[PDB]
Amino acid sequence: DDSELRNAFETALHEFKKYHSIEAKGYDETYKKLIMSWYYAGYYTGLAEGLAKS
Amino acid sequence: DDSELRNAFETALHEFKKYHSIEAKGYDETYKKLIMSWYYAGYYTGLAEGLAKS
Amino acid sequence: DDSELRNAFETALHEFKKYHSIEAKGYDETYKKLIMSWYYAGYYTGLAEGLAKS
Amino acid sequence: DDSELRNAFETALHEFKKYHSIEAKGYDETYKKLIMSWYYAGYYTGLAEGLAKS
């Protein structure tokens, strides 16, 4: 009956939210690489400056 | 004339747009400081390692 | 004959040339990582700004 | 006497080292532009990629 369509809709709704949660996961890993990249840029910057004072 | 009183509306309308988005601005500043902090942790870690080698 | 023993000299002479210039090679690798690090800091900074605009 | 020549030589020696210190200054600024250029190449690369995901 019309119950099968409503059940199908909740399924498609579950897949929709499951998809955006993956999208959010991707944005999270992106911002972690952003932070590490700034850490290493500072590290090799400081390291070169330190070797020069030799 | 109208120009004086009209700007007083856009002026007030401006400060109220700021107020409505102070939290979002706070998250933004929080993440800028996060990024600068990790840069600097890296900087001073690399510097110290570079000075030690001499 | 001579070919076998002669190559053993150039072979050993090679590894010892490497040893004599490991520090200079270290400075070189340090500066390659410095360059890649700043590229990546820029990459992820620009990406995040580009995603935010949507 | 021969003291004037030795004094003249130390002067010319001072100018010689003062010149190479400028040369070293030029090599330094060159490597800073090298690093910034890689930063901006990454930045505009990331930024374009970010706008595309729109």
Numbering used by the authors:
A (entry chain A), B (entry chain B), C (entry chain B), D (entry chain A): 10 to 35, 120 to 147
Task: Recite the paper's sentences.
The macromolecular SMN complex facilitates the formation of Sm-class ribonucleoproteins involved in mRNA processing (UsnRNPs). Here we report on the identification and structural determination of the SMN complex from the lower eukaryote Schizosaccharomyces pombe, consisting of SMN, Gemin2, 6, 7, 8 and Sm proteins. The core of the SMN complex is formed by several copies of SMN tethered through its C-terminal alpha-helices arranged with alternating polarity. This creates a central platform onto which Gemin8 binds and recruits Gemins 6 and 7.
To re-evaluate this interaction, an SpSMN fragment lacking its unstructured middle region (SpSMNΔ36–119) was co-expressed with a fragment of SpG2 lacking the N-terminus (SpG2ΔN80). We could detect clear electron density for SpSMNΔ36–119 but no electron density could be assigned to SpG2ΔN80, suggesting that the latter had dissociated and/or precipitated during crystallization. The structure revealed the SpSMN N-terminal G2 binding domain (residues 10–35) and the C-terminal YG-domain (residues 120–147) encompassing the YG-box and the serine-motif. Two molecules of SpSMNΔ36–119 in the asymmetric unit (termed the glycine–zipper dimeric unit), interact via the YG-box residues of interfacing helices. Interestingly, a closer inspection of the crystallographic packing showed that each glycine–zipper dimeric unit is stacked upon each other in an anti-parallel fashion around a screw axis between S130 and A134, leading to an infinite stacking along the crystallographic A axis. This interface, termed the anti-parallel interface, buries a surface area of 592 Å2 which is similar to the 620 Å2 buried surface area within the glycine–zipper interface. Anti-parallel stacking of glycine–zipper dimeric units is facilitated by the serine-motif where S130 and A134 pack against A134 and S130, respectively, of the interfacing helix of the adjacent dimeric unit, through mainchain atoms. The methyl group of each A134 forms hydrophobic contacts with the W131 sidechain of the interfacing helix. The sidechains of each W131 are stabilized by hydrogen bonding to the interfacing T138 sidechains. Our results thus corroborate the previous notion that the SMN glycine–zipper dimers are the fundamental unit of higher order oligomers and reveal a novel anti-parallel interface between glycine–zipper dimers required for higher order oligomer formation.
